[PDB]
Amino acid sequence: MFMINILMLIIPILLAVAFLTLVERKVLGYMQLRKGPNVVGPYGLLQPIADAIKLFIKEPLRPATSSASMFILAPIMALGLALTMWIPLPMPYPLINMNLGVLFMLAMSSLAVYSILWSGWASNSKYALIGALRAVAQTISYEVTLAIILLSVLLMSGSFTLSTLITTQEQMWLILPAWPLAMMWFISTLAETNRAPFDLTEGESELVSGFNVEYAAGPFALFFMAEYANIIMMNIFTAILFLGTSHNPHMPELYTINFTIKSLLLTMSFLWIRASYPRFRYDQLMHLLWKNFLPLTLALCMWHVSLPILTSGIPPQ
């Protein structure tokens, strides 16, 4: 019954991305002083099952001046890596016990930009031709802001597995000994996964969001779908790394209860940022990576190399 476990994880998470689109706007609504979806629910709660069927009735045109084998291959690789990344992730037991899987996250988070380079090219012209080229350019630069300060906690964890990442935090809630790194951990995933203040991928008044701009609601229904699957997955990855919960072997039930409550709270922030702050005007977006984000990340890197040595506090492995 291994095969019944995989389907027990793909299916209960497509609701949690469909019942986030509803909480996308109720939370964003009471900031504006207005109620949620009022009339169809009764409370709203039945909105996404009606708002899903309309997309698969509405005619999925392909553009006449488009290519063929590239345009319908990027949504295959969209939902592939958006759902494959949920595998090696402990809660409290992961589906797969990888020896080194923290690196496997970057082995999965690297190839997502290789679909945007397809879809911006595969269909058509300037509102997604050059307008998606400068969306690959922001997402590549926020790995070296990411991969360094992901390594900067592993000097204190001890190894590459994720079971040690819960063992080392039984008494600490490790956001305290590394709170400068925890800041730039947030803004990276806030800009890499293409969200509200550092936007130009989706597109406000930029490429009039020319990375979708062309998908009718047949193939478009996943892009949004798949994408919303990253944003609840960097939140499930931050809360297993910094704000780690407590594991008890005799009681694994109380792990998940105290766990899903925490990833939901960080997921609120991606909604709660959007209702405050304006955009970044593509220069100043990348003007603060090199000049401003990056030299501090090397500074704490050299700090976290020497401090396990000159404390005589080497983590065991």
Binding site: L33, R34, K35, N38, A275, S276
Partner: protein, 176 residues
């Protein structure tokens, strides 16, 4: 006179630079700024629940048209041709005839509801106080062939209520 805004140099000493270098680096703004001003969600939302609740209006409101008539009926119009001469948009189209009894009346009366720019110039040009902008925005028909009004629509539309209209004009004729 004057007022100068954004005309002030920084202090530029040893003390207040740490006050500004705590801002850029550790964000004493941008959380005290807008992590608190936004939430502040704890007010009661103000949404008119539209199919049941409706919003406030005023007894001089402009809307659907009507033609009143006297106590026991006389079709208060007398076809004096003023409500058609000060429509700015030339909607009204009157063609009178001497009716058989001797008093003159209309035969055809036509108000487009698309050229109607909703002045209130028909409402106030009338001497015999007949054509009244009535207070009901109920509209939204599905054909352009329909919004052209005849005479015998307006009377029906003007006798679906007069308890509505005559409560309004009695309140408001004292100013004009």
């Amino acid at each position: 006179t004057y007022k100068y805004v954004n005309l002030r140099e920084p202090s530029m000493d040893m003390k207040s630079v740490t006050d500004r270098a705590a801002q850029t680096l550790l964000w004493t703004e941008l959380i005290r700024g807008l992590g608190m001003t936004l939430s502040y969600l704890f007010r009661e939302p103000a949404t008119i629940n539209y199919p049941f609740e409706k919003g406030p209006l005023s007894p001089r409101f402009r809307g659907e048209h009507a033609l009143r008539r006297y106590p026991s009926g006389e079709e208060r119009c007398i076809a004096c041709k003023l409500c058609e001469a000060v429509c700015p948009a030339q909607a009204i189209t009157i063609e009178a005839e001497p009716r058989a009894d001797g008093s003159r009346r209309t035969t055809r009366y036509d108000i487009d509801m698309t050229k109607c720019i909703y002045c209130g110039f028909c409402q106030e040009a009338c001497p015999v106080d007949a054509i009244v902008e009535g207070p009901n925005f109920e509209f939204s028909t599905e054909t352009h062939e329909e919004l052209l009004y005849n005479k015998e629509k307006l009377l029906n539309n003007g006798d679906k209520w007069e308890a509505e209209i005559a409560a309004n004009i009695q309140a408001d004729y004292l100013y004009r």
